[PDB]
Amino acid sequence: VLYVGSKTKEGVVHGVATVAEKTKEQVTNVGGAVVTGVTAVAQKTVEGAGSIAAATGFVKK
Amino acid sequence: VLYVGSKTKEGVVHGVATVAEKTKEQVTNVGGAVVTGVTAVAQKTVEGAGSIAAATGFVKK
Amino acid sequence: VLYVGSKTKEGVVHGVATVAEKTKEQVTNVGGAVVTGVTAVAQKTVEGAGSIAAATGFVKK
Amino acid sequence: VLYVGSKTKEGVVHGVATVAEKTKEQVTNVGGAVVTGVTAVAQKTVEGAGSIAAATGFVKK
Amino acid sequence: VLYVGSKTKEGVVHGVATVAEKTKEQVTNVGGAVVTGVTAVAQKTVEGAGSIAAATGFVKK
Amino acid sequence: VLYVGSKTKEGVVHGVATVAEKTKEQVTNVGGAVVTGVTAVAQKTVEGAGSIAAATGFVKK
Amino acid sequence: VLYVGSKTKEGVVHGVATVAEKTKEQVTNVGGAVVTGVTAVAQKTVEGAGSIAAATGFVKK
Amino acid sequence: VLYVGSKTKEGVVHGVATVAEKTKEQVTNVGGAVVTGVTAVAQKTVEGAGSIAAATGFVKK
Amino acid sequence: VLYVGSKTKEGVVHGVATVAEKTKEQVTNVGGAVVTGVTAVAQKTVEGAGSIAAATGFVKK
Amino acid sequence: VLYVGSKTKEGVVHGVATVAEKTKEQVTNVGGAVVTGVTAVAQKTVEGAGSIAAATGFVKK
Amino acid sequence: VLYVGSKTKEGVVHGVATVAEKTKEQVTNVGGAVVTGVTAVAQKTVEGAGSIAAATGFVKK
Amino acid sequence: VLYVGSKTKEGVVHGVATVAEKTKEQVTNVGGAVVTGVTAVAQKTVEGAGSIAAATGFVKK
Amino acid sequence: VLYVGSKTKEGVVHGVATVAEKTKEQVTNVGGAVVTGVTAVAQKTVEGAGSIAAATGFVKK
Amino acid sequence: VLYVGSKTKEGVVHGVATVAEKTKEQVTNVGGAVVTGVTAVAQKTVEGAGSIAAATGFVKK
Amino acid sequence: VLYVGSKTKEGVVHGVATVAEKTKEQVTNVGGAVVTGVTAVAQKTVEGAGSIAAATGFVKK
Amino acid sequence: VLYVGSKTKEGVVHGVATVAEKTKEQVTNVGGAVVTGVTAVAQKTVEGAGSIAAATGFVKK
Amino acid sequence: VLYVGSKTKEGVVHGVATVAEKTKEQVTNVGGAVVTGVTAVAQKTVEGAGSIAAATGFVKK
Amino acid sequence: VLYVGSKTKEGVVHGVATVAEKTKEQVTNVGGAVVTGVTAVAQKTVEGAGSIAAATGFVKK
């Protein structure tokens, strides 16, 4: 790999704006998964055999 | 690897703005997972065999 | 690895602004996991076999 | 590794501003985990076999 | 490793500003873990076999 | 390792400002762990086999 | 290790400002752990086999 | 180790300012641990097998 | 070890300013530990097998 | 005016999130007006004869 | 005016989050006005004859 | 005016979070006005004849 | 004016968090005005004829 | 004016947290005004004819 | 004026935390005004005809 | 004026924490004014005709 | 004036903590004014015609 | 004036803690004024016509 006077972006999350407004919110949960929010993941290299790189709201049995 | 006068970004999260407003919020949980917020993860290299790199609201049995 | 007069960012979280406002909040929990906040994780290299790099609101049995 | 007149950032969290306001908050917990706050973790290198690098609100049995 | 006239940051948390305001807060806990505050961890190198590097609000049995 | 006219920061926490204001706060605890405050940990190298480097609000049985 | 005309910081916590104000605070505790304050830990090297480097609000049985 | 005309800081805590104000505070304790104050620990090298380096609000049985 | 015209700080706590003001404070204790004050510990080298280097508010049975 | 158990908002600006990023910016000005930023004005009542209530980037001769 | 058990907001600015990033910025000014920032003004009542209530980047001759 | 068991906010600015980052900034000024920062003004009542209530970056001749 | 068991805020600025970072900054000024910082003004009542209540970066001739 | 069991805030600035970091800063000034810092002003009542209540970076001729 | 069992704050500045860090700073001044620091002013009542209540970095000719 | 069982604060500055760190600072001054520090002023009543109540870095000719 | 079982604070400065650290500082002054330190002024009543109540770094000609 | 079972503070400065550390300091002065230290002034009543109540670093011609 060789860069000469260059600009690069590799695996980047940028420039996110969010506004949320709720009056009444209720969550009832048993042994599962619930995600209500802002989530950002940036990765360059993930290596493995049976791996999991990024997971949001995941149930494994 | 060789960089000569270059600019790079590898595995970066930047520039996130969030506003939230709730009047009434209730959460009832049994042995699962609940995530309600702002989460940011930035990684360059993750290596393994059966690993988990990034997880938000995850249940494993 | 060789850098000559370069600028790099590897595994970085930066520039996060958050405003939150709640009037009434209630959380009831049994032996699970609940996360309601701001979380930021930045890593360059994680190595292993069956490891877990980043986890927010995780239940393992 | 060789740097000549360069600037780098590796595994860095910087520039985080947060404002929170709550009128009434109640938390009832049994032997699980609850996290409501600001958390920042920055690491360069973590090595192992079955290790856990970063965890927020985690239950292991 | 060789640096000649360079500037680096490796495993650093810097520039965090937080304001919080609560009118009524109540926490009832049994033998689990609750964290409500500001937490910052910066590490350069952690090595082991089945170790835990950073943990906030963690229950191990 | 050799540095010639360089500036480095390795495992550093710096520049943290916090303001908190509460009117009524109550904590009831049984043999678990509760943390409500400002915590900062900076480490360069931690080595071991099954060690724990940094822990805030941790229960081990 | 050799430094020639360099400046370094390794395992340092510096520049922390905090203001807190509470009107009524009550803590009831049984044989667990509660921490409500400002805590700062800076270490360069910790070595062992099954040691614990830094712990705040920790219960071990 | 050899330094020639260099400046270093290794395992240092410096520059901490805190202001606290409480109107009514009450603590009831049974044989656990409670810490409400300012605590600063700076160490360069800690070596052992199953030792504990820094602990604040810790219960061991 | 050899220093030629250098300046170093190893295991140092310096520059701490604190102001506290309480109107009514009450502490009731049974055979545990309570610490409410300013504590500063600076050490360079601690060696042992199962020793404890620094402890504030610690209960051992 | 009479309100009995009601909720009102009169002249309010709330919930604004903005992210901006510029590489090169140049402004050359002679005696006029230039505004490049975030501006928010909230007013309930303004009274007069030839008044000006809200103005952004205004030239009057 | 009479309120009985009501909640009101009159002339309020709240919940604003902003992130900005510039690489090179240059401003050249002669006797005019330039504003590049975050500005928030909240007023309830302004009274007069030829007054000016709120002005940002204004030139009057 | 009569309030019975009510909550009001009149002329209030609250909940503002900002992060800024610039690499090179230059300002050249002759007898005008330049403002680059965070400004917040909250007023309840301003009365007059030809007055100016709030002004940011204003030139009057 | 009569309040019976009420809570009010009139002319208040509260909850502001800011982080700024600049590498090179230069200001050249002739007899004008330049403001680069954080400014907060809170007033309840200002009365006059041709007065000026709040001004930031103002030139009057 | 009559308050019976009420809580009020009139002309108050509270809860401000700021972190700033600059590498090189230069200011050249001729007989004008430059302000680069944190400024907070809180007033309840200002009365006059042609007075100036609050001014930051002001030039009057 | 009559208060019966009430709590008030009138013209108060409280809860301000600031951290600043500069590597090189230079100021050259001719007969103007420069202010670079933390300034807090709290007043209840100021009365006059052509008076000036609060001024920071002000030039009058 | 009559208070019966009340608590008031009128013209008060309280709860200010500041940390500053500079490596090289130089100030060159001719007959103007320069202020670089922490300044706090609290006043209840100031009366006059053409008086000046609070001034920091002021030049009058 | 009549107080019956009340607590008041009028014109008070309290609770200020500051830490400063400089490596090289140089001041060159001609017949102006320079102030670099901590200054606190608390006054209850100042009366006059053309008086000056509080001044820090002031030049009058 | 009549107080019955009350507690008051009028014109008081209390609770100030400061730590300073300088390596090299140089001051060159011609017939102006320079102040580098800790200064505290508390006054209850000052009366006059063209008097000066409190002054730190003041030049009058």
UniProtKB/Swiss-Prot annotation, chains A, B, C, D, E, F, G, H, I, J, K, L, M, N, O, P, Q, R:
Residues annotated with Phosphoserine modification: 51
Amino-acid positions noted as binding Cu cation in the UniProt annotation, renumbered to this chain: 14
Tissue: Highly expressed in presynaptic terminals in the central nervous system. Expressed principally in brain.
Outcome recorded upon mutating residue 10 to K: In PARK1 and DLB; significant increase in binding to negatively charged phospholipid liposomes; increases oligomerization
Region annotation (4 X 11 AA tandem repeats of [EGS]-K-T-K-[EQ]-[GQ]-V-X(4)) ranges: 1-31
Cysteine disulfide partners in this protein: none
Sequence repeats: 6-20, 21-31
Assembly mode: Soluble monomer. Homotetramer. A dynamic intracellular population of tetramers and monomers coexists normally and the tetramer plays an essential role in maintaining homeostasis. Interacts with UCHL1. Interacts with phospholipase D and histones. Interacts (via N-terminus) with synphilin-1/SNCAIP; this interaction promotes formation of SNCA inclusions in the cytoplasm. Interacts with CALM1. Interacts with STXBP1; this interaction controls SNCA self-replicating aggregation. Interacts with SNARE components VAMP2 and SNAP25; these interactions allows SNARE complex assembly and integrity.
Function of the protein: Neuronal protein that plays several roles in synaptic activity such as regulation of synaptic vesicle trafficking and subsequent neurotransmitter release. Participates as a monomer in synaptic vesicle exocytosis by enhancing vesicle priming, fusion and dilation of exocytotic fusion pores. Mechanistically, acts by increasing local Ca(2+) release from microdomains which is essential for the enhancement of ATP-induced exocytosis.
Reported disease: Genetic alterations of SNCA resulting in aberrant polymerization into fibrils, are associated with several neurodegenerative diseases (synucleinopathies). SNCA fibrillar aggregates represent the major non A-beta component of Alzheimer disease amyloid plaque, and a major component of Lewy body inclusions. They are also found within Lewy body (LB)-like intraneuronal inclusions, glial inclusions and axonal spheroids in neurodegeneration with brain iron accumulation type 1.
Family, per entry: Belongs to the synuclein family.
Protein name, entry field: Alpha-synuclein
